[PDB]
Design a protein around this motif. Structure first.
Motif, PDB file in Angstrom:
ATOM      1  N   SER A 249       0.623  -1.246   0.314  1.00  0.00           N
ATOM      2  CA  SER A 249      -0.413   0.135   0.223  1.00  0.00           C
ATOM      3  C   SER A 249       0.406   1.210   0.085  1.00  0.00           C
ATOM      4  CB  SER A 249      -1.124  -0.037   1.230  1.00  0.00           C
ATOM      5  OG  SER A 249       0.203   0.013   2.353  1.00  0.00           O
TER       6      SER A 249
ATOM      7  N   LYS B 294      -2.469  -1.501  -2.792  1.00  0.00           N
ATOM      8  CA  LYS B 294      -3.323  -0.414  -3.248  1.00  0.00           C
ATOM      9  C   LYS B 294      -2.328   1.135  -3.378  1.00  0.00           C
ATOM     10  CE  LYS B 294      -5.877  -1.761   0.435  1.00  0.00           C
ATOM     11  NZ  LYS B 294      -6.172  -3.576  -0.387  1.00  0.00           N
TER      12      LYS B 294
ATOM     13  N   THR C  76      -6.199  -2.106  -6.092  1.00  0.00           N
ATOM     14  CA  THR C  76      -6.811  -0.665  -6.968  1.00  0.00           C
ATOM     15  C   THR C  76      -5.984   0.647  -6.272  1.00  0.00           C
ATOM     16  OG1 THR C  76      -7.233  -0.873  -3.875  1.00  0.00           O
ATOM     17  CG2 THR C  76      -9.015  -2.075  -5.396  1.00  0.00           C
TER      18      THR C  76
END
Ligand SMILES: *[C@@H]1O[C@H](CO)[C@@H](O)[C@H](O)[C@H]1NC(C)=O
Ligand SMILES: *[C@@H]1O[C@H](CO)[C@@H](O)[C@H](O)[C@H]1NC(C)=O
Ligand SMILES: O=C(O)[C@@H](O)[C@@H]1O[C@@H](O)[C@H](O)[C@H]1O
Ligand SMILES: O=C(O)[C@H]1O[C@@H](O)[C@H](O)[C@@H](O)[C@H]1O
Ligand SMILES: [Cl-]
Length: 333
Positions: free
Chosen positions: A247, A286, A313
């Motif tokens: 992330s 992420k 994402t």
């Protein structure tokens, strides 16, 4: 059999148990340990390296079946005395790599603090080499963006496992540049440029790599496979990403590219990539608002790439140019 100085290090032949005391490695010296086969080397203090004009490595250990017991001690590279925002690309001389580990055995539980630039060079090996529970703490290099090219582990070696390590730095967490049978498992990477294979240069071949169970945070890339556009007689084959949690990525969640040093454009054809999979446990990535999720930029890639366990994402879609390779599954487009 106790090393209290650079000169003592030269006197350890015949020691099956070496104690590495704390001391300063003075300017213009290096610390070289060539322990007996199967010896245990136990660190009992921190080793500080005064600012030096020498090229690295400043510490080299080379032996067969070595058992290195760090006892949480530190190799302090004094990197802030060198950092100038330019790394090994220009500016002040940076002794690099800081440490070099060669041969085989098991290295545990020590810290590299503030390497001048690339922290630990691994290889070549003569049997399996395991690095376990090592911390590369170059976090101070984030200040004023002065640390740079502070790679955690640069690997050119066969039969390597790096596990349970922590890297806080400003460049690749690991860069796997050459070798077969390399496992990077259950590591924590932050601040740097993510988990990389390459850049792949002419004549270099990376194969049978497992990148499993790692966490990457606050990094420029999540995972990359980078090959120099101009490389020939080179390859990457057999890479499995499994169970990585990523992330806070600024540029690309995944970048697989044969355009290095550019991220994309006129990719090269002489460093073919094959058999790259995201399988096993979910690899979830992420990315930040301005980042790209996944880009594949192949001039020469092959195989059935099973990306079923990848989810990326955030940010925006990248582009897929996979040449002969067929990429199946995942969520990232
Ligand atoms: C190093 O700087 C010189 C001049 O400062 C420049 O010619 C060169 O391209 C730079 N190299 C890198 C890697 O920055
Ligand atoms: C080391 O790697 C070489 C090439 O991959 C292989 O021939 C050898 O069996 C490996 N040795 C061990 C101990 O893994
Ligand atoms: O992939 C590459 O060629 C680069 O990241 C190099 O790796 C490392 O040796 C240094 O960060 C940089 O010179
Ligand atoms: O991550 C990368 O490939 C690159 O990162 C840049 O920031 C660095 O200046 C380059 O030397 C190379 O390490
Ligand atoms: Cl010097």
């Amino acid at each position: 059999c106790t090393v209290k100085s650079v000169d003592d290090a030269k006197d350890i032949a015949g020691c099956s148990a070496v104690t590495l005391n704390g001391f300063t490695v003075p300017a213009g010296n290096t610390l070289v340990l060539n322990p007996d086969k199967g010896a245990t080397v136990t660190m009992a203090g921190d080793i500080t390296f005064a600012k030096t004009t020498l090229d690295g490595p400043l510490f080299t250990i080379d032996g067969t079946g070595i058992n290195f017991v760090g006892a949480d001690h530190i190799f302090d590279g004094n990197g802030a005395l060198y950092w100038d925002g330019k790394g090994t690309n220009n500016g002040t001389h940076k002794p690099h790599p800081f440490l070099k580990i060669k041969g085989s055995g098991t290295y545990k539980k020590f810290e590299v603090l503030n390497s001048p630039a690339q922290a630990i060079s691994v290889g070549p090996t003569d049997a399996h080499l395991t690095l376990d529970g090592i911390t590369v703490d170059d976090f101070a290099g984030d200040t004023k963006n002065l640390g740079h090219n502070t790679d955690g582990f640069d690997v050119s070696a066969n039969n390597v496992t790096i596990q349970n390590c922590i890297v806080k730095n400003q460049d690749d967490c690991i860069a796997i540049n050459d070798g077969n049978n390399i496992r990077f498992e259950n590591n924590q990477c932050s601040g740097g440029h993510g988990i990389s294979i390459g850049s792949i240069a002419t004549g270099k071949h990376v194969s049978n790599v497992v990148i499993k169970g790692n966490t990457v945070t606050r990094s420029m890339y999540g995972v990359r496979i980078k090959a120099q556009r101009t490389a020939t007689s080179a390859s990457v084959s057999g890479v499995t990403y499994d169970a990585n949690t990523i992330s806070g990525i600024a540029k690309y969640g995944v970048l697989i590219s044969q355009s290095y040093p550019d991220d994309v454009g006129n990719p090269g054809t002489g460093a073919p990539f094959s058999d790259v999979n995201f399988t096993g446990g979910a690899t979830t990535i992420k990315v930040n608002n301005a980042a790209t999720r996944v880009t594949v930029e192949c001039g020469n890639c092959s195989g059935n790439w099973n990306w079923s366990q990848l989810t990326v994402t955030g940010g925006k879609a990248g582009t897929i140019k996979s040449d002969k390779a067929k990429i199946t599954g995942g969520q990232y487009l």
